[PDB]
Design an enzyme around this catalytic site. Structure first.
Site, PDB file in Angstrom:
ATOM      1  N   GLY A 162      52.122  43.747  37.384  1.00 56.77           N
ATOM      2  CA  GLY A 162      51.040  43.941  38.533  1.00 56.77           C
ATOM      3  C   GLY A 162      51.604  44.295  39.690  1.00 56.77           C
ATOM      4  O   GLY A 162      52.877  44.286  40.029  1.00 56.77           O
ATOM      5  N   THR A 163      50.614  44.982  40.750  1.00 55.96           N
ATOM      6  CA  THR A 163      50.931  45.220  41.879  1.00 55.96           C
ATOM      7  C   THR A 163      51.156  43.968  42.979  1.00 55.96           C
ATOM      8  O   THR A 163      50.639  42.954  42.485  1.00 55.96           O
ATOM      9  CB  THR A 163      49.635  46.067  42.690  1.00 55.96           C
ATOM     10  N   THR A 164      51.591  44.145  44.173  1.00 54.77           N
ATOM     11  CA  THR A 164      52.168  43.016  45.063  1.00 54.77           C
ATOM     12  C   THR A 164      50.808  42.628  45.712  1.00 54.77           C
ATOM     13  O   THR A 164      50.025  43.298  46.049  1.00 54.77           O
ATOM     14  CB  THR A 164      53.135  43.474  45.886  1.00 54.77           C
ATOM     15  N   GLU A 216      48.536  45.222  47.385  1.00 49.38           N
ATOM     16  CA  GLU A 216      49.052  46.569  47.496  1.00 49.38           C
ATOM     17  C   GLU A 216      47.850  47.048  46.368  1.00 49.38           C
ATOM     18  O   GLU A 216      47.761  46.372  45.064  1.00 49.38           O
ATOM     19  CB  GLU A 216      50.505  46.495  46.954  1.00 49.38           C
TER      20      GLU A 216
END
Ligand SMILES: [Mg+2]
Ligand SMILES: [Mg+2]
Lengths: 240, 241, 250, 235, 244, 243, 111, 231, 195
Positions: free
Chosen positions: F29-31, F46
């Protein structure tokens, strides 16, 4: 409650549990039905891998659903009892609400409906049973013979057979039953019925059962006594 | 080998899922120890905060179940909290129904019976935890009762749990074979805590700062856990040998 | 969607074996030896208290359990399974007998109930059989003294004397030699202590041996007087001391 | 095994696709829709000469303005017809009006995908639902056990359907009379049926705004088979 | 999900047999032989037990022969525990009929309901069938003396003489050989023992491995007595017929 | 094997492979991060821009629970929403009985027990998210991070998703170089920077920054989104530190 | 004892012309001897060229009008935007009212 | 592989194959386009006939006066999800006298799809939706994906060859975003975008379907003779 | 509705049942048969609340007819009466009990003896030589107590009934428009087609 889909489609578009239910019918003792002109006769093979039976008390292979409709079957005996019980309850229920006994077509359509329901319900296998349902609609003298099978399809037959070596006797009846000329007398229809079993049934002994249904709830079963008299007679007609 | 995935018997009469739940017990790589004073029951567990981003106060495997009962868990934290919440609920309900505080050994039996069910019923997995219950029971005095994923429980003179459990056990075994009594013959809980930390250092052969330990004490009518400072105080006294 | 296991985990194999009952019996075979003996004026059940640690207080873990004041049970196999079965056995003795008839169930009736619970674990959806065999010893006014064995299948049989677990084969032979139909209870306690020595490897004293009798009525154990027809429990666990007393004349 | 409601990597439901195979094995059924009426015709396919062919009921009435032809596991259609009749009669009770043919079909098609771990498997039968309503006139619908239904000017379903459909593609125009459609259904049936088309192993029906949905008697169809055979002798 | 671990106890083989029913019947074939013989004037139930230790309690016992009501008894072949579940059902079902109709339950109706229960376990519920076959020996005032058997399939049939359990092929031949309709109870008792004597899988057929019961016309006339033989009476009837 | 095909099965190691497979979806996944400050907490995430067809400002990923709790998560977004919906039911039910709004540690265990419960049965799948959440209760600020196993602890700072390692290291710096405390407004800027720094690993597409905060002084103990001006300030501070 | 019904008074009037229809009602809402509102309309346009009033107990009146208006909405959704005939509307309202046969809407309905 | 048996199973990479297989049914689905200015939101959907004798599968469903969606994939699933959405719009109207926010319709659809992906014996929805609506904060377009992923966009396309339209719209962004007060110019842009996703066959009268909602426009569907004007 | 009578003689059971059906102010019908045949040799007459009597009688009739088909056997009148009592005893603690009183007249073919059972709506059963329900008893029981003998012929029974019906027509305030009489013997059920 157990949910599992036991009757499901296969890639070839077959439902194997239904088709295997038919294999159980194939194995079942032979049953045959023949329309007279004003009677229907149900004939039933009974295997002789066992004697020392008590036949007063052993389940008889033709059952009364009402006083004017009977049901024979080929396949699992225990399964047949469940279909017979439901059909007898539905017959009394029909009388209670419609104030008229079931038509043979209706009672057939009901039993067929039960059989079908078990081919697309979770946690149940289909009935290992095909049935012959025979009798007369109330205040009607035109005879009725229907067949049901585990899939739930049902249809009317001039004459029909189910169970082991039924392909043999269906070939016999196809050859020995004129639709233009149905067995006019009771004796005539009873004779043709026994003859078709004798292609398959081994001896005339306590191997054959005949039940005869006439109009206006006139149902009576023949004792070995009176069947022997056909077995004796057809044997002595083979002298060509 | 699907007899390895659910709690059904193997051909040699074994429940592999119960055995593998025991292996999860040691997954935290923490050792716990419990001893009885005359007046008290002391539970000590290693405290390891590997990450610096963790708030060390929120890292605990000791739970205050009731006013009187404390419970230390060897095993992963999610199964530990699951077990803790349940025992809190069970001890509160027992009080409401029967008009007196749930005894240590009764809660232990109850939680063990719950554990047993997961070994017999297939859809429930066993919890990968060993539950060490401690109190000063009003009828039985200082008490240690311990539960495992098998649904087994028994009372202990003292006990240890974790990877280095066997070393801590034989250490304690030897003290009692020698001292010849059921318990730590000590007046104050402070000196029974000191005893516990001492015999943990000897058996493990390692040294503890104030943030390397977690301590819980059961006395008459309250079970409580020591802060970093109450331990630090206790460590400092152990220095005088 | 929690419990989807509504189908049997015990089914018939082509050979006609019920795998999970056979495996449960295997689990009993591994269990610590327990036994029971019927005397003419009592019954004795006994087993070894094998300790997990020397730090465990083995008086806390009790293998011989009172079910009613006149019925006791002991087992071989999985201790936890035994524990929950004793709890259900005690409760069923009330719910389906005492709360109806105002008296405790007779031995074979209570045994029948325990057996029924164990049979359901053999057939009901989403459960394994119980991994224990029980020996249930009890007295009732109209049957006198009796001893029953209950297996994971839910099958039960009455015994003059028998044993189960590890050294049952060895012990059943020992008991055949020494059992007669004229044993006074004291004689059967002595024989039980002899039979149990064979199978017990380590220490053999009053603290490693659990032993209970179904004997005479114990007014001293009743907890009250004033009702002349309540004479108290026939079930009595022998003390650590009482066992060692008999290990003299051994 | 595997889930009953699972997707193939292609992104299609296995049990739906397998039911479509069962329907291909079924006896032929054809519908042609004209401005003068919609015609339904079916191959009866008696499995033996002893079974009484008029007891084979593969065309069925739903309301006076809606009829149904089926192909596949025909026992599976009992409950689909029952639901359709109930839906049609119910709508009349609530609104004192005839229920639109599309609305009927959509109602039947809502059943189709209510299956899995509600019924255990999809239906093994396709339906040709044909009727008339005031808003959209004469309509023919093909109702699959996928829950999808298409409107057709003409459509064939069952074993004979691949050929029959390409044959309908040719001969259908927007100005067909009812009589032409009756003949055209008899023609394409005779063309795809194993056994030889007579008035006992095939059956006709139409729905007109005027006289509603009628199943043709054996005598009426026999004379349309004569009219067909005569017609094809010419040119 | 959980589907992975489901045997599907209630499905057909490609030959149209019920796997679990067939395997339950295989199970029963390793069980102590039980025999029922119906005379003109009574019914005999004889059951052969499994190998028994000297310590096993001989007298106060009945693992094979169970009383359903005052006029009906069964001989069991298969799992004792499974049989007791079905027996308590049958005992209740008999008492329900009595309360409803103030008449003792006809033998077949009781046999049918038990058979219909067994049938249910083969068609729905995803549970294993009952690993039990029954010989029903009973009297009613419609058919008099009746012998039935039911098997895990839910099938039941009537018999003049029948065996269930081990060596039934062997036993059915011996019975078919020496049975006749006029035969009286004491002849049927003798036949039952002679049959087990020949089909037993150990050398000696002693009293301690036998359960025995008779349903006789013998009483104060018109009423029916049901006798579960004490071990001394089995020892007597074994010496009387000169098998010991 | 076979040990990894069913949820709630112990491997012979003593592990639940399906929970470990759940973690892979989180890492994928995104941060997303949480920075605990003096008197509050800051959440930043993010948001990858697949296309300029994304309406900016309009695909919000941070979720409020009650009035006073912020939740942000990395991995399977639907799973995160489903967990917040549960958190909202839990917080409403707590408030209803006890009148006081739910404490953050109390709230953490509600999600803890619920997520843990999805590792107990083969008939449910574990959560495909790590959740960073917290806010201001009557005992000050709390930051929490919760994983598919049901494991959760209180944090000084926390990170998850692709850029978890850079963020993790960048958080560690702050804990050392600000031991006495970080202010609310400080943590907002620091959060913007760390998301930009951790965008190194999702270098592929460019992204949209999203910050929220719950500060006793700055937002009165309520969770509010950092919008407009103070957002642009922290975006600018961050652009400057990737030079 | 709680009385779930009330009476908000008002009077309504529907007359059918050859190619028109009027449905009129006063705009006064009362309880006992008090006026609640001098303008509270109780004649509504339900769509599909249909006007409706449910006079008597205003709560049951508004509940029914609201349910029927929703009935029109779903008729469009389920029957491909078909216009609801006045006779079809009438029959639908019978089923709405008789749906509460054993706890009636205490209203006199005119469409 | 072994991990595509059902939705309750994760792959060792951490994927839900049953969901990816559901996503697949959408790309087999006929192309549909969504785009919106500040005053209007347009759906153009290319409809698929079964054969030359069949009707063209309707791909646009109305949910309220101010909201509706286009479908690509399993149409029965579009029916279920549209019907669920109608009720939520209807509930907001009846209880709160409030037209339901297009952004909330997204959240409810997402949360419904998610439930089918986490528990045993279910199945993901096999359809993708484009939701347009004029609500209390202007025009909106939403892309629903049966993983439960809902995204607010200026424009997009989903189904077979939808990548063509999606890049055209990505190019034309600043042209169409400022077609305020013009309904026809915003539709035209959509019909041009959908043409980038054709091959061999192109837009006839009864294969094309247009929906528009906006400031002074109830969500309405244009079919047959009433789309000839745009071919 | 109103008057229902039964008398067991030598070897038959006679049921007389009033023909009137009154709805408040008006006698709606003067030819009502308050009877169902349960089996070929068992007849039940009923009186009580409107609707419940026909509903209960037909429900019993269906259950007995189902039993006959299933077992190919006619239940004894004792067994049918025990079944019917249980149904009523069941229903008295129902949410809405059956408000029906019944006479069951049957010939027990197995014992060659006629049997009359009187069961009220509570499920109170008695075997009786002669029985009635409601107010019928108060007028007739004095006549039957006197004239009745266990060994009477059927025509003797009919004559004693004719006396009973006459006393009722004299002293009853209500006009019950005469009785339909039915006889149950070894040959089954027939109707005396005037009185
Ligand atoms: Mg388990
Ligand atoms: Mg009375």
């Amino acid at each position: 409650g157990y949910d599992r889909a036991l009757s499901i489609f296969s890639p070839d578009g077959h439902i194997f549990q239904v088709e295997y239910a038919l294999e159980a019918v194939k194995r079942g003792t032979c049953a045959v039905g023949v329309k007279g002109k004003n009677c229907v006769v149900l004939g039933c093979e009974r295997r002789s891998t066992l004697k020392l039976q008590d036949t007063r008390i052993t389940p008889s292979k033709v059952s009364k659903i009402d006083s004017h409709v009977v049901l024979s079957f080929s396949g699992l005996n225990a399964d047949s009892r469940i279909l017979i019980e439901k059909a007898r309850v539905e017959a009394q229920s029909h009388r209670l609400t419609l104030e008229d006994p079931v038509t043979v077509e209706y009672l057939t359509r009901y039993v067929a409906g039960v059989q079908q329901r078990y081919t697309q319900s979770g946690g149940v296998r289909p009935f290992g049973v095909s049935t012959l349902i025979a009798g007369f609609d109330p205040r009607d003298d035109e005879p009725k013979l229907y067949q049901t099978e585990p899939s739930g399809i049902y249809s009317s037959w001039s004459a029909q057979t189910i169970g082991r070596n039924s392909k043999t006797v269906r070939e016999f009846l196809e050859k020995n039953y004129d639709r233009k000329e149905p067995p006019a007398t009771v004796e005539e229809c009873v004779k043709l019925t026994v003859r078709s079993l004798l292609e398959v049934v081994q001896t005339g002994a306590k191997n054959i059962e005949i039940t005869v249904v006439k109009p206006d709830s006139d149902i009576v079963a023949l004792s070995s006594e009176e069947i022997n008299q056909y077995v004796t007679q057809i044997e002595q007609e083979k002298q060509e | 080998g699907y007899d390895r995935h659910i709690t059904i018997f193997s051909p040699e009469g074994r429940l592999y899922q119960v055995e593998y739940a025991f292996k999860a017990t040691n997954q935290t790589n923490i050792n716990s120890l419990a001893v009885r004073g005359k007046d008290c029951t002391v539970v000590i567990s290693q405290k390891k905060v590997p990450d610096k981003l963790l708030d060390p106060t929120t890292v605990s495997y000791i739970f205050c179940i009731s006013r009187t009962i404390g419970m230390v868990v060897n095993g992963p934290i999610p199964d530990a909290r699951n077990a803790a919440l349940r025992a809190k609920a069970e001890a509160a309900e027992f009080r409401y129904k029967y008009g007196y505080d749930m005894p240590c050994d009764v809660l232990a039996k109850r939680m063990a019976n719950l554990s047993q069910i997961y070994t017999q019923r297939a859809y429930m997995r066993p919890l990968g935890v060993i539950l060490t219950f401690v109190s000063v029971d009003e009828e039985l005095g200082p008490s240690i009762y311990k539960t495992d994923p098998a649904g087994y429980y028994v009372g202990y003179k003292a006990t240890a749990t974790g990877p280095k459990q066997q070393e801590i056990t034989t250490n304690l075994e030897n003290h009692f074979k020698k001292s010849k009594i059921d318990h730590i013959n000590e007046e104050s809980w402070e000196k029974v805590v000191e005893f516990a930390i001492t015999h943990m250092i000897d058996a493990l052969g390692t040294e503890f700062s104030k943030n390397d330990l977690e301590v819980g004490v059961a006395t008459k009518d309250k079970f409580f856990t020591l802060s970093a400072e109450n331990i630090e105080e206790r460590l400092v006294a152990i220095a005088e040998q | 969607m929690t419990d989807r296991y509504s189908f049997s985990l015990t089914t018939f194999s082509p050979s006609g074996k019920l795998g999970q009952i056979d495996y449960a019996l295997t689990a009993v075979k591994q269990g610590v030896t327990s036994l029971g003996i019927k005397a003419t004026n009592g019954v004795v059940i006994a087993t070894e208290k094998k300790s997990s640690s020397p730090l465990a207080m083995s008086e806390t873990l009790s293998k011989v359990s009172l079910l009613t004041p006149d019925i006791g049970a002991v087992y071989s196999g999985m201790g936890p399974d035994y524990r929950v079965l004793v709890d259900k056995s005690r409760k069923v003795a009330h719910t389906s007998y005492k709360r109806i008839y105002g008296e405790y169930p007779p031995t074979k009736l209570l045994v029948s109930e325990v057996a029924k619970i164990m049979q359901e674990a053999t057939q009901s959806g989403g459960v394994r059989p119980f991994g224990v065999s029980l020996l249930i010893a009890g007295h009732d006014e109209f049957n006198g003294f009796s001893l029953y064995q209950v297996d994971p299948s839910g099958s039960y049989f009455p015994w003059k004397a028998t044993a189960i677990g590890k050294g049952s084969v060895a012990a059943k032979t020992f008991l055949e030699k020494r059992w007669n139909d004229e044993l006074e209870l004291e004689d059967a306690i002595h024989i039980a202590l002899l039979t149990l020595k064979e199978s017990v490897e380590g220490e053999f004293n009053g603290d490693t041996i659990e032993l209970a009798i179904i004997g005479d009525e114990n007014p001293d154990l009743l907890g009250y007087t004033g009702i002349p027809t309540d004479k108290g429990p026939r079930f009595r666990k022998l003390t650590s001391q009482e066992i060692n007393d008999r290990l003299e004349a051994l | 095994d595997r889930g009953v409601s699972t997707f193939s990597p292609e992104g299609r439901l296995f049990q739906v696709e397998y039911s479509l195979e069962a329907i291909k094995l079924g006896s032929t059924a054809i519908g042609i829709a004209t401005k003068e009426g919609v015609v339904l015709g079916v191959e009866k396919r008696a499995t033996s000469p002893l079974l009484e062919s008029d007891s084979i009921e593969k065309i069925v009435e739903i309301d006076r303005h809606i009829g149904c032809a089926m192909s596949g596991l025909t026992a599976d259609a009992r409950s689909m017809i029952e639901h359709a009749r109930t839906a049609a009669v119910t709508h009349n009770l609530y609104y004192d009006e005839d229920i639109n043919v599309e609305s009927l079909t959509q109602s039947v098609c809502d059943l189709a995908l209510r299956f899995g771990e509600l019924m255990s498997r999809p239906f093994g039968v396709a339906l040709l639902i044909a009727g008339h309503d005031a808003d959209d006139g004469y309509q023919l619908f093909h109702a699959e056990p996928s829950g999808t239904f298409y409107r057709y000017n003409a459509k064939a379903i069952g074993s004979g359907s691949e050929g029959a459909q390409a044959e309908l593609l040719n001969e259908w125009h927007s100005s067909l009379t009812l009589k032409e459609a009756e003949l055209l259904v008899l023609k394409i049936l005779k063309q795809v049926m194993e056994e030889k088309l007579d008035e006992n192993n095939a059956q006709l029906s139409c729905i007109t705004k005027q006289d509603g949905f009628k199943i043709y008697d054996n005598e009426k169809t026999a004379e349309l088979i004569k009219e067909l055979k005569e017609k094809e002798a010419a040119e | 999900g959980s589907r992975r671990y489901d045997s599907r106890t209630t499905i057909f083989s490609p030959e149209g047999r019920l796997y679990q029913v067939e395997y339950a019947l295989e199970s029963i074939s390793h069980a102590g032989t039980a025999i029922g013989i119906m005379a003109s004037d009574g019914i005999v139930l004889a059951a052969e037990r499994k190998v028994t230790s000297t310590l096993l309690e001989q007298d106060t016992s009945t693992e094979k022969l169970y009383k359903l009501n005052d006029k009906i008894a069964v001989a069991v072949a298969g799992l004792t525990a499974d049989a007791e579940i079905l027996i308590n059902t049958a005992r209740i079902h008999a008492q329900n009929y009595l309360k409803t109709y103030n008449e003792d339950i006809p033998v077949e109706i009781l046999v049918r309901r038990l058979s219909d229960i067994k049938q249910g376990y083969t068609q729905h519920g995803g549970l294993r069938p009952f690993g039990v076959s029954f010989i029903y020996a009973g009297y009613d005032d419609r058919y008099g003396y009746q012998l039935y058997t039911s098997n895990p399939s839910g099938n039941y049939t009537g018999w003049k003489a029948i065996s269930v359990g081990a060596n039934t092929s062997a036993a059915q031949t011996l019975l078919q050989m020496d049975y006749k309709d006029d035969m009286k109870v004491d002849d049927a008792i003798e036949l039952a023992l002679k049959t087990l004597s020949k089909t037993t899988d150990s050398s000696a057929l002693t009293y301690d491995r036998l359960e025995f019961a008779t349903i006789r016309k013998g009483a104060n006339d018109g009423e029916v007595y049901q006798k579960i033989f004490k071990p001394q009476e089995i020892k007597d009837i074994l010496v009387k017929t000169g098998i010991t | 094997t076979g040990y990894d095909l069913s949820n709630s099965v112990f491997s012979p190691d003593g592990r639940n492979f399906q929970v470990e497979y759940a973690v892979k979806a989180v890492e994928n996944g995104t941060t997303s991060i949480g920075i605990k400050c003096n008197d509050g907490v800051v959440f930043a995430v993010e948001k990858l821009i697949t296309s300029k067809l994304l309406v900016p400002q309009k695909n919000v990923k941070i979720q409020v629970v009650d009035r006073h709790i912020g939740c942000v998560y990395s991995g399977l977004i639907p799973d995160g929403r489903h967990l917040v919906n549960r958190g909202r039911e839990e917080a409403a039910s707590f408030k209803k009985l006890y009148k006081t709004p739910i404490p953050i540690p109390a709230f953490a265990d509600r999600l803890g027990q619920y997520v843990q419960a999805h590792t107990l049965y083969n008939s449910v799948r574990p959560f495909g998210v790590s959740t960073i959440f917290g806010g201001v209760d009557k005992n000050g600020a709390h930051l929490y991070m919760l994983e598919p196993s049901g494991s959760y602890w209180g944090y000084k700072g926390a990170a998850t998703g692709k850029g978890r390692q850079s963020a993790k290291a960048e958080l560690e710096k702050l804990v050392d170089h600000h031991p006495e405390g970080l202010s609310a407004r400080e943590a907002v800027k620091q959060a913007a920077k760390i998301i930009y720094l951790a965008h190194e690993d999702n270098k592929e597409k460019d992204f949209e920054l999203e910050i929220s905060w719950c500060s006793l002084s700055e937002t009165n103990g309520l969770h509010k989104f950092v919008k407009g001006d103070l957002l642009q300030e922290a975006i600018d501070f961050a652009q400057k530190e990737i030079n | 004892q709680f009385n779930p019904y009330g009476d908000n008074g008002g009077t309504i009037l529907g007359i059918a012309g050859e190619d028109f229809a009027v449905l009129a009602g006063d705009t006064r809402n009362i309880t006992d001897y008090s006026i609640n509102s001098r303008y509270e309309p109780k004649v509504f346009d339900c769509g599909d060229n249909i006007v409706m009033s449910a006079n008597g107990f205003a709560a049951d009146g508004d509940a029914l009008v609201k349910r029927f208006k929703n009935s029109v909405k779903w008729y469009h959704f389920d029957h491909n935007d078909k216009k609801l005939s006045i006779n079809s509307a009438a029959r639908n309202i019978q089923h709405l009212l008789y749906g509460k046969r054993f706890f009636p809407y205490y209203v006199h309905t005119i469409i | 592989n072994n991990y595509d048996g059902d939705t309750v199973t994760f792959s060792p990479t951490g994927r839900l194959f049953q969901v990816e297989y559901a996503l697949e049914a959408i790309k087999q689905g006929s192309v549909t386009v969504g785009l919106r200015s500040n005053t209007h939101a347009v759906l153009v959907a290319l409809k698929r006939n079964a054969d030359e004798l069949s009707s063209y599968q309707k791909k646009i469903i109305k949910c309220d006066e101010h909201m509706g969606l286009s479908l690509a994939g399993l149409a029965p699933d579009a029916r279920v999800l549209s019907n669920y959405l109608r009720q939520q719009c209807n509930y907001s109207s009846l209880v709160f006298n409030r037209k339901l926010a297009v952004e909330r319709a997204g959240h409810l659809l997402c949360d419904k799809a998610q439930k089918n992906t986490q528990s045993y014996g279910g199945r993901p929805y096999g359809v993708g939706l484009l939701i347009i609506g004029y609500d209390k904060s202007g025009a909106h377009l939403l892309e629903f994906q049966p993983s439960g992923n809902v995204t607010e966009l200026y424009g997009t396309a989903i189904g077979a060859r939808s990548q063509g339209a999606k890049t055209y719209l990505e190019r034309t962004l600043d042209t169409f975003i400022k077609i305020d007060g013009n309904p026809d110019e915003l539709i035209k842009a959509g019909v041009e975008a959908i043409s980038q996703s054709l091959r061999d066959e192109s837009l006839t009268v009864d294969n094309l379907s247009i929906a528009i909602v906006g400031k002074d426009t109830p969500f309405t569907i244009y079919d047959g003779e009433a789309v000839a004007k745009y071919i | 509705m109103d008057i229902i009578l039964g008398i067991r003689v030598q070897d038959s059971v006679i049921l007389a049942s009033s023909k009137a059906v009154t709805r408040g102010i008006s006698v709606l019908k003067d030819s009502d048969d308050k009877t169902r045949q349960l089996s070929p040799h068992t007849l039940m007459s009923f009186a009580g609340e409107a609707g419940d009597t026909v509903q209960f009688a037909e429900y019993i009739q269906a259950n007995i007819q189902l039993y006959s088909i299933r077992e190919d056997y006619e239940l004894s009148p004792q067994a049918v009466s025990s079944f019917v009592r249980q149904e009523l005893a069941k229903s008295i603690r129902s949410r809405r009990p059956y408000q029906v009183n019944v006479l069951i007249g049957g010939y027990d073919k197995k014992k060659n003896k006629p049997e009359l059972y009187q069961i009220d709506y509570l499920g109170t059963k008695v075997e009786l030589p002669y029985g009635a329900h409601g107010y019928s008893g108060f007028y007739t029981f004095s006549l039957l107590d006197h004239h009745y003998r266990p060994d009477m012929t059927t025509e003797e029974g009919l004559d004693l009934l004719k006396l009973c019906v006459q006393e009722l027509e004299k002293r009853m305030p209500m006009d019950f428009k005469g009785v339909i009489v039915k006889i149950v013997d070894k040959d089954g059920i027939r109707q005396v087609d005037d009185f």
